[PDB]
């Protein structure tokens, strides 16, 4: 019955194991889903991610603020941004970014390494597709990767509003232990595999309703080993089925309350509202962004 869902989320019992890290060997490696005529993998993948995010308790305020890293394709367009703009309520402010130049439907686009991106405001949702194929080296030890993952971890801790959520792409080899540890700072978390791309070790690590403190203590090396163990022992049938029913696709505008509060004012009552998708804590000023430019000869 998984074939009619948008994808498969890591079952909770697998999160509780203490597996050793193994090589990822997917039974359905190299199979492919049959996409609807003329639909790109990236559109299908983001559509299924958004369909799954519709099932979670995302905070959806007025003036929602969403930022999308890794949004450029090698053809210079932004398919994932186009799906996000379709999904998010009209009037949502959407910013995207990538190392390479591209044209986008986002409200603003920054070109450069994500480490150069700075924002004045906090954000309600962070989406990342960033990935370096140089990490797929099967001939060497699979350790926690830094690069753009270091930026993402700091960016969550500094610029994600309390109550906000994230979806960060990982793979067998493209992962970071601190990012898994940060999943314990949300009210709930999972690793989500799209049904269209189930032949790949990619998943989106989803943190749902940021609390700004450790709710649970997660060892990221162990948790990534748990993720691979799940993938190794649970073949996922490739499926496009959910792409053909878009009647309920748009994210529900919940009008979630936005409050400004200071560290000492976050009590158990506030933490409960945050945990239920019913509160966003940040300022509601102007959204201002920038990219650092290195000047040289």
């Amino acid at each position: 019955s998984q074939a009619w869902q948008p994808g498969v989320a890591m079952p909770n019992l697998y999160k509780m194991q203490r597996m050793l890290l193994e090589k990822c060997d997917l039974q359905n490696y190299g199979d492919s889903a049959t996409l609807p005529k003329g639909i790109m993998m990236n559109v299908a993948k983001y559509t299924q991610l958004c369909q799954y995010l519709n099932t979670l308790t995302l905070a959806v305020p007025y003036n929602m603020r969403v930022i999308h890293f890794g949004a450029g394709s090698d053809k210079g367009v932004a398919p994932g941004t186009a799906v996000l703009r379709q999904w998010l309520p009209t009037g949502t402010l959407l910013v995207d970014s990538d190392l390479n130049d591209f044209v986008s439907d986002a409200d603003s686009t920054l070109i450069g390494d994500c480490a150069t991106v700075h924002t004045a405001n906090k954000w309600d949702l962070i989406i990342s597709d960033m990935y370096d194929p140089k990490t797929k080296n099967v001939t060497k030890e699979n350790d926690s990767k830094e690069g753009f993952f270091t930026y993402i971890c700091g960016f969550i801790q500094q610029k994600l509003a309390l109550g906000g959520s994230v979806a960060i792409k990982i793979t067998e080899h493209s992962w970071n232990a601190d990012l898994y540890k940060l999943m314990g700072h949300f009210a709930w978390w999972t690793a989500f595999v799209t049904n269209v791309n189930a032949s790949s070790s990619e998943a989106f690590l989803i943190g749902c309703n940021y609390l700004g403190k450790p709710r649970e203590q997660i060892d990221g090396y162990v948790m990534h080993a748990n993720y691979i163990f799940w993938r190794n022992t649970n073949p996922i049938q490739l499926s496009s089925y959910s792409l053909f029913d878009m009647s309920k696709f748009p994210l529900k505008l919940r009008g979630t309350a936005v409050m400004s509060l200071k560290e000492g004012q976050i009590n158990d009552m506030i933490l409960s509202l945050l945990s239920k998708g019913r509160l966003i804590i940040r300022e509601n000023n102007r959204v201002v962004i920038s990219s650092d430019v290195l000047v040289n000869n």
Binding site: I39, D101, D105, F249
Partner: protein, 115 residues
């Protein structure tokens, strides 16, 4: 007085038999929408495909200025509905056709204001 005329160059390359611009971003949708030409969310009907607007704009895709004093783009950040029979070349179709300002449909592809 010199200005690069990319619209003419693309039309002429199309007439010469050149392959249309590819990788326009086609959306999944119900295909039960209003059928209007350029919309805030995908609105294709049964006879249309919906595409991300920026990917269908000649000036966006070629990295050149938009032909307007303030340089504004009518497509970027929106979705453009393209008749399915014309969806092999969305850029050419947006470039060659006009939106009716009263009903929002493409003239000759859904506009019935003249009947």
């Amino acid at each position: 007085a010199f200005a690069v005329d990319a619209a003419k160059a693309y039309k002429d390359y199309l007439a010469s038999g050149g392959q249309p611009i590819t990788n326009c971003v086609k959306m999944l949708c119900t295909h039960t929408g209003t059928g209007q030409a350029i919309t805030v969310t995908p609105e294709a009907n049964m006879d249309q495909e919906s595409f991300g607007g920026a990917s269908c704009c000649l000036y966006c895709r070629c990295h050149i200025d938009h032909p307007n004093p303030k340089g504004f783009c009518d497509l970027k950040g929106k979705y453009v509905q393209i008749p399915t029979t014309c969806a092999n070349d969305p850029v050419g179709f947006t470039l060659k056709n006009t939106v009716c300002t009263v009903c929002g449909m493409w003239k000759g592809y859904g506009c019935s204001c003249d009947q």
